[PDB]
Amino acid sequence: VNSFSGYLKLTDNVYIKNADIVEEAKKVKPTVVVNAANVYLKHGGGVAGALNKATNNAMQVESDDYIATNGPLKVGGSCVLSGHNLAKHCLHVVGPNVNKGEDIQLLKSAYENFNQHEVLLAPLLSAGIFGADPIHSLRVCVDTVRTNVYLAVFDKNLYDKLVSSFL
Ligand SMILES: O=C(N[C@H]1c2cccc(O)c2C[C@H]1C(=O)O)c1cnc(NC2CCOCC2)cn1
């Protein structure tokens, strides 16, 4: 049993809710919150910009030190950093950004990072300003992630579409 509330069980292991991942993180304090990161960990907009703003920029400060030491992530890759006031840990995962011309096949590799964590709160990868098909991202999630994932979907109209089209 866990404290995630009002989630629609889609499969054995995938759950979804129309909710703000920030409030959801602030309420649940999950072991892992996933960030929709880029390779430079520059949290400018979307989930990344929103989570960073909620951490009073501490996420960005930590991320800049990470990049200075380790260099950029790979598209499809991830790193584990602090969850600050939102979670124990933040799993920064880089899905492909269609608005940068990145290969959508890398979306499966991105979701594979979730399998290293037993339970996660996460956004649907490569949705919103990343420009990939969200019905597609949800399908890849369901077909790739085997651990227990709670997807918080910010946009209500996206959520309603994701529910009504899920096979
Ligand atoms: O851009 C946001 N989400 C979309 C996005 C963007 C980029 C990559 C992605 O994978 C996704 C998933 C998609 C969604 O979930 O709809 C977002 C923005 N802000 C939020 N929280 C604020 C907290 C303070 O008050 C205002 C709201 C919560 N989500």
Swiss-Prot record:
Subunit comment for this entry? Answer: May form homohexamers. Interacts with N protein.
Q: Name the consequence of S164L.
A: In strain: Gamma/P.1
**Taxonomic lineage of this organism?**
Viruses, Riboviria, Orthornavirae, Pisuviricota, Pisoniviricetes
Question: What, per the annotation, is the impact of changing T31A?
Answer: In strain: Mu/B.1.621
**What is this protein's gene name?**
rep
Q: Please list which residues make up the signal peptide.
A: none
Question: Catalytic activity, per the record?
Answer: Thiol-dependent hydrolysis of ester, thioester, amide, peptide and isopeptide bonds formed by the C-terminal Gly of ubiquitin (a 76-residue protein attached to proteins as an intracellular targeting signal)
- The UniProt record lists the Macro domain at 1-167
Coiled-coil residues are: none
**Activity regulation info:** Inhibited in vitro by GRL-0617.
Q: Where in the cell is it found?
A: Host endoplasmic reticulum membrane
Name of this chain's protein: Papain-like protease nsp3
Q: Covered residues of the complete protein?
A: 1025 to 1191 of 7096
List the membrane topology term(s).
Multi-pass membrane protein
Could you tell me what this protein does?
Responsible for the cleavages located at the N-terminus of the replicase polyprotein. Participates together with nsp4 in the assembly of virally-induced cytoplasmic double-membrane vesicles necessary for viral replication. Antagonizes innate immune induction of type I interferon by blocking the phosphorylation, dimerization and subsequent nuclear translocation of host IRF3. Also prevents host NF-kappa-B signaling. In addition, PL-PRO possesses a deubiquitinating/deISGylating activity and processes both 'Lys-48'- and 'Lys-63'-linked polyubiquitin chains from cellular substrates.
